Amino acid sequence: MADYLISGGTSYVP
Amino acid sequence: SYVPDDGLTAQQLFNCGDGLTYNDFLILPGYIDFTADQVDLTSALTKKITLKTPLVSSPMDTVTEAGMAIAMALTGGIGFIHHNCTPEFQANEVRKVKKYEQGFITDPVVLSPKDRVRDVFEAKARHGFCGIPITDTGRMGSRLVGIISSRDIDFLKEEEHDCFLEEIMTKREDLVVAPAGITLKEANEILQRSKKGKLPIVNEDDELVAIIARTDLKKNRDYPLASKDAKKQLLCGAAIGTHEDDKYRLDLLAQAGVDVVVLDSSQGNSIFQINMIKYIKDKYPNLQVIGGNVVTAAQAKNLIDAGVDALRVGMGSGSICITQEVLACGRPQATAVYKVSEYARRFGVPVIADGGIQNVGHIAKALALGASTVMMGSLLAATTEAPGEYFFSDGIRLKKYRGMGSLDAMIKVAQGVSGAVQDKGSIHKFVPYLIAGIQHSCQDIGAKSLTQVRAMMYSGELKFEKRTSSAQVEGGVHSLHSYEKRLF
Amino acid sequence: SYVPDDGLTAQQLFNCGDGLTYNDFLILPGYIDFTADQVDLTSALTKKITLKTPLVSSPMDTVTEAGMAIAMALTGGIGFIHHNCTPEFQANEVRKVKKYEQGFITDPVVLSPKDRVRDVFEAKARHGFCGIPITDTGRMGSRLVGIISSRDIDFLKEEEHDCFLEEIMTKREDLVVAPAGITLKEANEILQRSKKGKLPIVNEDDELVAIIARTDLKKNRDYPLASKDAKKQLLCGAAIGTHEDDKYRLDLLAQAGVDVVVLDSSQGNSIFQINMIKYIKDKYPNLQVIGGNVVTAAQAKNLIDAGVDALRVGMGSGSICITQEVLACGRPQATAVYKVSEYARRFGVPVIADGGIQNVGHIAKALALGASTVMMGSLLAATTEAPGEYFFSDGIRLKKYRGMGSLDAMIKVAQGVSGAVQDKGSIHKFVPYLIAGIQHSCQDIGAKSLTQVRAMMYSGELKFEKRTSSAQVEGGVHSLHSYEKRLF
Amino acid sequence: MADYLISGGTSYVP
């Protein structure tokens, strides 16, 4: 869909 | 495995402090294990609605209108319709694109049966076509009477006798009309068994609504990536300003049913735009807004906290901008797409790069840096369905192209320039080359999807490299006497 | 009245011996009592066949073949097809222009209903239409059965499965037909009141002898002056050489039915031309020939009494011609078209002018110096109907252009060059601009017909004036930084 | 027509 579709998975990890 | 560390990852590249542009770095290739067509370049525009292709036009008066809207709608993207006009004008053309019925041709003209034939004589050359339906009162909301054609009114020398159209054409006796809500190929079957070149459609109450043309059904190409909504109308957005009277614009637009709006400005971190997001997000909760323009993470934060759903990144890097030459603001936007999208992925917000694009390489380097979709203004200018019309100059076919802050659009200041760019043809022939450009680029990068090429960039296994000026003179065409550069 | 003698008449202006060309002199105006549409420009091509416009095409391999031949004959002009090809090629293209419009279509292509629909596919690939008749035996001399048109085969995926022509055709009885022994006016009134498109012609015994089309009448009202003969086809011409094997080229054109033929040469006054005209006038007495090139009256004499029916003048004076530079022969064009015409009107022989025409004003000056029609080489090339195809170079779209005397068209010498010239669009929107310019020039001169302007020239009424070099660089565009000229 | 259509009328007058 959409929120997955930028990067996917855990997706930030500072 | 081993994977030697030759290259620069993105947080190593864009922390050296230099302002990098698109033709200043490039992407190292990697392992490929799939063929060219089967990479699916599905990208997002906002927090809810997604696209098949990551292209999207820019909202200027000179690039995007209803034709550009329908075209980029059906070829995968969206277009945004400018606000350089009256509100009812923009509402009228967003209503023109929003229905469109995919090839069932829209806005027919109509005559009364009392009407004469010099009017259809002038309207044949005013518009171009010949087949016109007729109702009782000569308007769309009336019971059907019949149809005319140039096979009906050609060779009659009685045109000044106040001709009455009941005594001319075929009313109901040879008439065939399909039942309403009929599909493309089934109605096409009705035409091709009917041996008749024009087909009205009526409801249960005999009201003409829509209409076809026969010659279009010889090349009714299906567009499999068409980007149309839950009620199967095309995704199509618009853009409105920030000055207070645009409330009367956007409520008319929401009456017309616009689903994404863009709040364009030179730089978007105003109280005006933040208060207008606060004005929108309590009145139209299903409507989704595009904020902009932002180049830094600070004005990215100060918009996304308000409730905006996607950022439009990049000021001062237009093809027709002079706001770095005048307002001394902006930043080189290949740094801006990274340092805004790095903040924008924290909150689940897609970002939209605009300007600086003049080839299909730059859109690949843009959306590999974290951009979800790419707004193009000059590269999609000088096409067939761009507004305005062609004029030859120096022997080169071109049509004019002009910026919103350029005072040929508007004491005030100038933030743009007016000019012209040579032609490109219609974009049904042009943007599949752009899709193939993304497709071969993400081929050699080594990712099966744009979502995972951004996932490869933020992870670190996708690695960039700096490029110097004496390497940029070497990257293009060099050491030839005369070259001819044909992209497709 | 008084009418002061301000100016120089033609016989005063061309016996000075100066090598005057078109853009070296110009025409003084006179009295006006009419409009631009009111003047006709029906001119003569040969001693017997006349044209509605004086604009004929050139016989080169890069300006005219059947495409510009039909497209210019539809305008009112005429087309010659170059002899730089195999004779069967020039034969089937001169049939193709002699086709594509008939009235009473004698012996069309027709089939028997036993064959399949896959065959009419390559028949349309060989003819370009699908409005085909069907007879019982198969050939034209057979009993009428039915017809099918372009509107029947839009739903067959099967190429030969259930594709027998018997079960898909309109019956014989519900075909609007007309008996034989009919002329064409009540035939096309039956056709236009049928609203059915085609009209078979039969005898009392249902034997199909002819067929009528409707696109003929579409072209009739779309092209109201289009130079058609007694059998109502487009008149056409063809180029031949002058060697001995060209006798086999000419009779192939003669069975094809060409109406005029031009003797292409670098220098007309040969034994070869007068011998082949003597070879023609006993074999084809109704066929009329064009003989050239001539530039002086002394070689006009021994062509007119040989039997040449119109003269094709001008050597050394083309856009791609260099024979003044290599062979050092010829003369300037305007003093040629004055003196050859002034000799030729003694014997009632029309005269057509070649070369040097760059714009509309050269056509008006050529027609004012006694020429009957005007032949244009580079001004007509690089159009939509020119043969070859477009190609880019530095972004200006253009088309290659190349003469016979250029060695690329062939130890021989070169009398021409091969080059290129930019596009001027299709001619259906271009040569009406030339007709409008000619008739505006005849308006400013003061003659409501080209017969009248040539009578005013030879009578001494229409008088000219010499123009110097500084005066002719004053005539165009000057004294400004930049400009673009749009003509039509 | 062409015998008339070139000049018309007198047509030479030496």
Ligand SMILES: NC(=O)c1ccc[n+]([C@@H]2O[C@H](COP(=O)([O-])OP(=O)(O)OC[C@H]3O[C@@H](n4cnc5c(N)ncnc54)[C@H](O)[C@@H]3O)[C@@H](O)[C@H]2O)c1
């Ligand atoms: N690279 C880019 O993306 C870029 C850069 C410059 C300009 N532009 C385009 O050119 C246009 C000009 O930008 P603009 O925002 O300055 O023009 P504008 O008409 O939208 O606003 C004019 C300026 O007045 C102020 N403003 C905003 N709302 C106001 C309000 N209610 N009352 C008083 N002042 C208000 C702002 O400073 C604004 O810049 C824009 O439409 C923009 O799309 C684009």
Ligand SMILES: NC(=O)c1ccc[n+]([C@@H]2O[C@H](COP(=O)([O-])OP(=O)(O)OC[C@H]3O[C@@H](n4cnc5c(N)ncnc54)[C@H](O)[C@@H]3O)[C@@H](O)[C@H]2O)c1
């Ligand atoms: N401004 C002009 O109109 C112009 C000027 C120069 C050349 N051209 C073009 O150049 C083309 C070819 O040049 P060309 O006219 O010299 O070709 P051509 O057909 O006349 O033959 C070339 C030479 O053969 C000679 N010739 C004629 N009949 C012959 C025969 N039976 N046997 C042997 N030789 C014979 C001719 O005298 C000529 O010198 C021409 O088709 C013409 O269109 C045009």
Ligand SMILES: Nc1nc2c(ncn2[C@@H]2O[C@H](COP(=O)(O)OP(=O)(O)OP(=O)(O)O)[C@@H](O)[C@H]2O)c(=O)[nH]1
């Ligand atoms: N089927 C057919 N009919 C024609 C064509 N051209 C003209 N007609 C019509 O046939 C009629 C007979 O022609 P004429 O009256 O003898 O001569 P004309 O009217 O000067 O010829 P046009 O200018 O072509 O109309 C014309 O009035 C035309 O209306 C044609 O090409 N095909």
Ligand SMILES: Nc1nc2c(ncn2[C@@H]2O[C@H](COP(=O)(O)OP(=O)(O)OP(=O)(O)O)[C@@H](O)[C@H]2O)c(=O)[nH]1
């Ligand atoms: N249909 C048809 N046209 C012919 C024939 N012979 C010559 N023509 C000429 O070729 C021209 C082109 O034919 P068109 O009628 O335009 O072909 P189309 O567009 O498919 O339309 P229809 O054939 O009438 O269905 C006609 O106008 C005729 O003047 C023939 O046998 N059949």
Ligand SMILES: Nc1ncnc2c1ncn2[C@@H]1O[C@H](COP(=O)(O)OP(=O)(O)OP(=O)(O)O)[C@@H](O)[C@H]1O
């Ligand atoms: N009622 C109509 N309303 C609007 N446009 C029409 C209409 N009918 C035809 N057209 C437009 O004109 C284009 C060409 O369609 P079409 O050629 O079949 O019409 P036509 O009546 O047959 O005119 P013509 O006789 O010139 O062919 C269509 O793609 C369509 O855009």
Ligand SMILES: Nc1ncnc2c1ncn2[C@@H]1O[C@H](COP(=O)(O)OP(=O)(O)OP(=O)(O)O)[C@@H](O)[C@H]1O
């Ligand atoms: N729904 C229809 N209902 C009634 N008559 C029709 C219908 N469709 C076609 N026709 C009739 O048959 C004729 C054929 O229509 P057609 O579309 O072929 O003509 P056109 O619009 O002028 O375009 P063209 O002449 O180029 O074919 C019409 O004049 C009309 O009389």
Ligand SMILES: Nc1ncnc2c1ncn2[C@@H]1O[C@H](COP(=O)(O)OP(=O)(O)OP(=O)(O)O)[C@@H](O)[C@H]1O
């Ligand atoms: N004299 C005629 N009388 C009755 N019906 C005819 C006649 N001529 C053609 N038709 C019928 O009308 C149908 C359509 O033929 P038509 O002449 O209209 O094709 P067309 O419109 O010229 O093709 P296109 O649109 O490519 O120009 C035919 O299949 C045939 O059944």
Ligand SMILES: O=c1[nH]cnc2c1ncn2[C@@H]1O[C@H](COP(=O)(O)O)[C@@H](O)[C@H]1O
């Ligand atoms: O008038 C202007 N002044 C400065 N930038 C503009 C103006 N009008 C449009 N732009 C920007 O230029 C972009 C067009 O991209 P480009 O023309 O391909 O460089 C738009 O998306 C806007 O962000």
Ligand SMILES: O=c1[nH]cnc2c1ncn2[C@@H]1O[C@H](COP(=O)(O)O)[C@@H](O)[C@H]1O
């Ligand atoms: O190859 C050639 N060498 C010299 N003259 C030519 C040649 N081919 C055609 N011509 C002449 O040049 C005319 C066209 O010249 P233009 O109208 O000035 O382009 C033709 O009608 C011919 O008479």
